[PDB]
């Protein structure tokens, strides 16, 4: 018999005894992300092209909203806005939730895939919510995941018992279970960095992808692939194996990629899922908020493989 | 005041003074290519899982039953398929068309952005159409293009008069013209290449991709981008400007795409697109091929950057 | 703040404070519901026809599934079983589903609205589940309701608390709450009833209908709509009031329309609505059933509209 | 080995060496078709409905700003408009179009199934094209059909060469034709009428129905049905068999049913099938337009039952 999000998110929710809220959070998020493939997809276009009778922004207002009425919320912190968003007691909820409502948005010219990520924090300090609320480690992650619009649209869900991918049905809006308990190869053979910054990545990241091209055992040299999405790279990382990197350099002394809305959720789903997800000094969970919009450099994916690169920082230190 | 890829190809035959065969056979593109985009997207795919009690094989069938279905073809020549299909002489049109169904399957399972490619022939002589009836340069080539499944589906057409974009609907079934007569940018700022390969390439790629990473006038440096599907790549390419290569190595000596339906389509679209297409020695276009699933070195993009590298290739002759 | 059918449903099983059995089992039917409207819209006919590569059987073959693996259910009758269908151990949950799949099939050939009905009982008498547990008074009713596939798909759910509708936007696929605590007109103006068995209509109904053409006092005679479909006959009935009418004759002395899964869930409706719902005798939610297949005589509409044929039936005793 | 409307309608245009100006704009028909469908099954009301922060309107200006675009007309004729719409001489074509781009519109709420209906005359004459070219009689008609937006969309198509049925494909956008050459029944089994209006039938009408209800020669009744949408009542009759009828009474002594755009497709589908089409005196195809708003009485169905009626029309003549 087949599990559809809606139902496998009240079996869970029934399984932990929760009051529901969290069931109404997560029902929510799944309503947004089927409205925004729908956008993203292009459904009505023929309307902009007068048949007669703007998709970050877009993006942003349908997670909002559809967040704020699910009455579960207090607290919310997207890639887009400048400050966290505290929501109206009348709709208060205990939950703390950092989105990227649509990632990788350059590419939205070239089609390239692209994303929505999320991590959902529990607040703690019942003071009047506030954004320290969201400055929590993302060890303290109680649930995140993200949609990916690829070939076909699929949500990756982490919370701690595992990692679970649905498929959406778009016939008949239903994302289908259709892997269970994901866990990341030990070991890959992809490696995905933008190398047009050569030039200015350290010495551990240049041993490392030499490593790769010309392998001191003559093996294989890995593959690589560079969507320039992230959700997209990750995802395949995930999946497939390998390893991601958006390492500091010159132009990002601090990384690029933002720590609560891009990397905690990439990170979080990463070690659910059996793979490593570092800093080069650092675990990236581990590490505590002081901004909101706080960058922050990352390297995830299949345990050997960061490991490795791990070994070899170490070396320069 | 909208145009419809229905309206546009109609109008297109009829100012050509067509007899309706050519119409009919994009046409019938047109439709194949919406029930791809469709299997793509998984619509469906609830019943696979049980709500009641491949990929390749499936867009294989789609396009071969409905270009048959056209009666304006008489030789078909698929990737999937070790020989060319004759057509019926009940349905035979003088039509040969080149394909690959599902371009970048191996990227399915990562739902990677994925693509159809197709490149148009007249039947040029008299006697029983065959195989050698396809056997024609690139340069004979009436219409070429492609349908790329990203995160809205896109069909890019090229003919004599030049290129168009139409971006598919999936509310109405209906491609919207979008982008008129597209023109690649002279110049672009991002080279594509799978550098996992670094060990296997020639003196004259390597240096290219060096000055790409350090560049010797002290100019910015290129970002780098590889998706892994070639449909993904190149339509990044054309829109975005940059360069794409897939010089041959180890992994054949002689290049990786197939000349008939990848890389002649690609070169087809990018010259009337005002971009270059060539193998470091000779235009793609004008390659005489010997054998239907010949393949063939192509590098394409902006004219500039393929010149540069065109030096290069000079320098090392 | 929009509300769908998902929220909606939980919101309500959280203030009723039930263990979330009920509530995953109304997940479960809207499921079904949207995979029904997908399938009767024809998604996917082209393959039936050849683009190369039943609608009860499949729709009774939905519900029976998805109602199964919802875990919530003991005891399932269908229009479409001769006998009750008892649910594996493995899979009892405490309700019973008496329902008919796809009402008005006859009428699939020329396009007429048709739609689903359901009624849900809780097994009461806790011995090994049967048949019995189904021969319940509609009055015994927890919840039920019925999905019209007309112009536009709909879900008309009533519960002890009130009726709502809510309308499928297949574009994400989610029931958005459209109207909010139905109440019917108290008296109407158009009559419903298929006047071709006039030869066999007892004289209450007889002379009902010629006091609706042929007003006593000269006000304007009833409008006359028959679609011949009974979910569509009583939509419009509960949304634009009037009296809709299906007594007994000859060919059916006891009525055509089944009680448990056509007239219980319909006289449900009509009564929390604010409408009466007899069989000219006595009222269909007191009737005791004996078996599960039943028929029965069936009058329901606006209040006012059914008393003044209810006077006319008293008046021929 | 499908066919697909696109494929048909060129194909046709093809055998009658047309220019392809009528193919453009049956082309253009379809699209307005399909895009005034998908607005019927509401997709897209979530945000009507606030999830990110008139009908009747909407179908009148895609067929009207669909059909100018197509450049194969020069009148346009539209139950919602005052006036006949004169193109614009920079689009205008030979082509007159008399239309009701959305007929039953008050059973809207109620989501009865609705239609859109059409009629195509060529413009007869040289001077500037004006009104008075829509006022023609029917039997002028070059094509007319009408698209019902019932369970399932379907578009019907009468030519000089026949009837054909083309199912719509909401998956991939795309009517096939499922049933070819089409022709109603002798005799049906169903009469309808809205029998509200009995106190002001004619004689004639009166005596039929009786005939129907109480037959002389002791043979079954017939079955009533009166959906109360002409497109969906009339698609029944061509399908199933039967008559229809709406003759005139209070409601104008002139009929309701309005001849241009409702009456004549309607009457010539009718023809195309095997039936008839009649006023009970003159056939409606033979009537010369006075208004582009004259209304006129109609029965059609199969030619038995119509000459049945036609000859009680004597009987009191
Ligand atoms: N849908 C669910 N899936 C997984 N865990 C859940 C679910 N619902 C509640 N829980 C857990 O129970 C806690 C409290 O639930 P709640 O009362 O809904 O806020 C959450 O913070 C989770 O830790
Ligand atoms: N839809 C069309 N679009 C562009 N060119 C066309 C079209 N139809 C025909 N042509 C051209 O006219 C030639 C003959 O058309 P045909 O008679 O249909 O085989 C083609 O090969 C093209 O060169
Ligand atoms: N979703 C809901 N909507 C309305 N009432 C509910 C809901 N869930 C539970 N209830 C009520 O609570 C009772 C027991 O709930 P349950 O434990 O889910 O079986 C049901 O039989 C209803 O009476
Ligand atoms: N698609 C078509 N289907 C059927 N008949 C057509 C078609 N196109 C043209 N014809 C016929 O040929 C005539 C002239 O076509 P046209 O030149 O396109 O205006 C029409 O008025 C019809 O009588
Ligand atoms: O548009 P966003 O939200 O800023 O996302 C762009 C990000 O940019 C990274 C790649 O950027 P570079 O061009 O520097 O490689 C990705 O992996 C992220 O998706
Ligand atoms: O479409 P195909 O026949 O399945 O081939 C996939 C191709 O493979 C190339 C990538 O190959 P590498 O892994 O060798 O970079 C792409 O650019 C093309 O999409
Ligand atoms: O196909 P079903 O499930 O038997 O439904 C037909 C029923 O039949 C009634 C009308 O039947 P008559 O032809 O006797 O009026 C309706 O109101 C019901 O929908
Ligand atoms: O399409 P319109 O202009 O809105 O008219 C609706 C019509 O109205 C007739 C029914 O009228 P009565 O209520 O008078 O039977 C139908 O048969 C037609 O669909
Ligand atoms: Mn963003
Ligand atoms: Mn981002
Ligand atoms: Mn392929
Ligand atoms: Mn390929
Ligand atoms: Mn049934
Ligand atoms: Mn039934
Ligand atoms: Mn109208
Ligand atoms: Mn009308």
Redesign the interface.
């Known amino acids: 018999?087949?599990?559809?999000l809606?139902?496998f998110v009240?079996?869970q929710?029934?399984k932990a005894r929760g009051?529901?809220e969290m069931?109404?959070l997560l029902?929510?998020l799944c309503?947004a992300v089927?409205?925004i493939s729908?956008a993203?997809?292009?459904?009505?276009?023929?309307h902009l092209?007068?048949?007669?009778?703007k998709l970050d922004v877009?993006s942003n207002?349908?997670v909002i909203?559809?967040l704020?009425?699910?009455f579960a919320t207090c607290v919310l912190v997207t890639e887009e806005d400048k400050n966290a968003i505290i929501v109206e007691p009348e709709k208060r909820g205990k939950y703390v939730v950092c989105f990227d409502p649509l990632d990788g948005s350059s590419?939205?010219?070239?089609?390239?895939?692209?994303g929505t990520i999320f991590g959902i924090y529990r607040k703690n300090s019942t003071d009047e919510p506030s954004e320290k609320d969201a400055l929590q480690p993302g060890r303290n992650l109680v649930a995140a995941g993200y949609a990916?619009?690829?070939?076909?649209?699929?949500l990756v869900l982490a919370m701690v018992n595992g990692v679970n991918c649905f498929?959406?049905?778009?016939?008949?809006?239903?994302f289908?279970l259709?892997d269970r308990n994901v866990k990341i190869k030990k070991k890959g053979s992809?490696?995905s960095i933008?190398?047009?910054?050569?030039?200015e990545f350290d010495p551990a990241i240049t041993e490392y992808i030499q490593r790769?091209?010309?392998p001191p055992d003559n093996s294989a040299?890995?593959?690589?692939?560079?969507?320039?999405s992230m959700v997209?790279d990750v995802?395949?990382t995930l999946?497939?194996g390998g390893i991601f990197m958006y390492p500091a350099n010159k132009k990002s002394p601090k990384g690029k990629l933002r720590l609560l809305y891009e990397c905690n959720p990439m990170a979080y789903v990463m070690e659910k899922a059996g793979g490593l997800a570092t800093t080069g000094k650092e675990a990236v969970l581990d590490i505590v908020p002081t901004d909101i919009h706080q960058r922050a450099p990352i390297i995830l994916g299949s345990p050997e493989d960061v490991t490795e690169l791990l070994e070899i920082y170490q070396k320069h230190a």
């Open positions: 018999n087949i599990v559809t809606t139902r009240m079996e929710g029934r009051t529901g069931t109404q029902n929510s309503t089927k409205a729908t993203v997809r292009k459904a009505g276009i023929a092209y007068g048949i007669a009778g877009l207002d349908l909203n559809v704020k009425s699910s590419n939205i010219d070239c089609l390239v895939s692209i990916l619009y690829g070939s076909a649209t699929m498929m959406l049905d778009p016939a008949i809006g239903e289908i259709v992809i490696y933008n190398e047009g910054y050569a030039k790769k091209k010309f040299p890995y593959g690589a692939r560079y969507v320039g997209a995802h395949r999946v497939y």
